[PDB]
């Protein structure tokens, strides 16, 4: 099935805002939360690379692919020379990769401020696990790297920063639509009673008083015709303030 079991870690005790990360937290483990705004497609990325030596046919490597480098050899030891190189199609290894952008939750922003945002990188079986609009919570390592174009942009030797994800909880996952034997027994016991139609009709929206026509229309529309449209469509029109 596999090669390696990953360990994900949850319930790390200290939370940070995106707004409050400093140079202290570089190469530390942190936990944040926010809303997804942008997500890329799933793409394969190099993980372990081997090369051919054109001069003598020797296979160079393996080289574990680092985060921000074009790793290459320079000398083939089996001929002790700088022979030309080609990528070995047969022994190169890939893994899935995805990049998302996360923003501070609008509920937690103070008076008159703008929310901040960060980029997050997902690898392997963490990919495809969330959508734009999801409230999520991330645990990972906060790191930095140099970028000369970012230096030229800001006019000072600033550094790019990222979070490498290690665990995600999606707070907007809906409940599983699966029923136990206890639930099915309760459904059968409810369905056996003779007053069940009036029970359902009156128990839809119990705070609203009257309007049994609207209640029965909604109740029969939640169930569906068998089908040739099977759906039952309902329109309401009413004065403002009439709780429509």
């Amino acid at each position: 099935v596999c090669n390696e079991i990953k360990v994900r870690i949850s319930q790390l005790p200290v939370e940070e805002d995106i707004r409050m990360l400093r140079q202290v937290h570089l190469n530390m483990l942190i936990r944040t939360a926010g809303v997804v705004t942008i997500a890329s497609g799933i793409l394969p990325q190099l993980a372990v690379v081997k090369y051919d030596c054109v001069a003598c046919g020797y296979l160079l490597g393996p080289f574990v692919q680092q985060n921000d480098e074009e790793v290459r050899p320079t000398i083939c030891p089996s001929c002790q020379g700088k022979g030309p190189f080609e990528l070995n199609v047969e022994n190169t290894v890939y893994h899935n990769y995805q990049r998302i952008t996360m923003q501070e939750s609008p509920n937690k922003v103070a008076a008159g401020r703008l929310p901040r945002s960060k980029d997050v990188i997902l690898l392997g079986d963490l990919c495809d696990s969330c959508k734009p609009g999801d409230e999520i919570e991330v645990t990972g390592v906060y790191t930095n790297n140099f970028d000369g174009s970012l230096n030229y942009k800001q006019g000072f030797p600033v550094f790019n920063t990222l979070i490498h994800a290690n665990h995600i909880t999606n707070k907007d996952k809906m409940a599983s639509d699966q029923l136990t034997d206890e639930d099915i027994k309760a459904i059968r016991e409810l369905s056996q009673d003779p007053n069940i139609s009036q029970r359902v009709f009156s128990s839809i929206a119990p705070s609203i008083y009257g309007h049994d026509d609207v209640k029965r229309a909604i109740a029969l529309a939640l169930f569906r015709g068998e089908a040739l449209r099977g759906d039952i469509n309902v329109l309401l029109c009413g004065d403002p303030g009439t709780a429509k």
Binding site: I38, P106, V109, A111, P115, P132
Partner: protein, 267 residues
């Protein structure tokens, strides 16, 4: 009222949700816009016309007009005493500026700044008698509007109770009270009524006639209708003229069999 409709739609979309949304080029975001709006406008025909309701004298759309708790209407009173008082106040402004002299207010504006900044930390709760009073005052408002349904300048719905609770909480914050009392609800209702308030014999008599005939439909000539009105010469002549107008102008009443003493029914 001089804004473009594009900018007015943008303000209304922000006022509905108390949020601003962005989706352009390479950024998407949502923001908070928790701000109170104070607005001023001039009436459409240059002067306010008291003979029409508020919907015609202002060029706003009804969804935008629904967003405001309080409307105030200000008119030129054309009164000698008020003109004299206004002229004295203007010349007192000029006289004080001419000698760099302050007025004798009770408090300093800085003290008022401290008071208003301090009072907004309070979060008053609703008391039991205040809840009872809120129910009673909402009933009073809707009853009086129903009594003047054809002539009131502005309708009354559920939203007025939300405005009433907001005004009561603001008054409690003004007095630094930790709970809403009966007096806050009472004065909020008084202020709301004073903001809201903005042929009739013909309506009253025609209403009595139509109400009797409509009630007689729960049981089912012109002289017999007049006799029922009189039992319930100027009044008889006025009733005949009212029936004449309700037939020949309003068409509320129809002559089922025509004649000098016709049978009548409601259209």
């Amino acid at each position: 009222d001089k804004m473009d409709l594009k900018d007015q739609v943008a303000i209304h979309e922000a006022m509905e949700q108390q949020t601003i949304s962005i989706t352009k080029a390479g950024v998407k975001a949502t923001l908070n816009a928790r701000a109170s709006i104070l607005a001023a406008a001039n009436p459409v025909n240059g002067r306010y016309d008291r003979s029409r309701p508020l919907k015609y004298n202002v060029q706003m759309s009804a969804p935008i007009m629904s967003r405001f708790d309080l409307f105030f209407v200000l008119v030129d009173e054309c009164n000698e005493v008020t003109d004299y008082a206004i002229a004295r106040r203007i010349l007192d402004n000029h006289r004080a500026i001419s000698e760099h002299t302050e007025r004798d207010s009770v408090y300093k504006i800085d003290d008022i700044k401290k008071y208003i900044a301090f009072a907004r930390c309070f979060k008053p709760k609703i008391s039991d008698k205040a809840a009872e009073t809120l129910v009673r005052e909402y009933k009073k408002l809707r009853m009086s509007d129903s009594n003047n349904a054809a002539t009131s300048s502005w309708r009354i719905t559920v939203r007025q109770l939300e405005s009433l609770v907001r005004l009561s909480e603001a008054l409690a914050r003004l007095h630094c009270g930790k709970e809403v009392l009966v007096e806050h609800v009472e004065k909020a209702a008084e202020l709301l009524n004073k903001s809201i308030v903005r042929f009739k014999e013909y309506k009253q008599l025609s209403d009595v006639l139509v109400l009797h005939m409509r009630s007689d439909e729960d049981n089912q000539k012109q002289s017999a209708l007049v006799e029922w009105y009189l039992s319930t010469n100027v009044q008889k002549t006025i009733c005949e003229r009212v029936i004449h107008r309700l037939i020949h102008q309003d068409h509320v009443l129809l002559e089922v069999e025509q004649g000098e003493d016709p049978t009548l029914c409601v259209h």
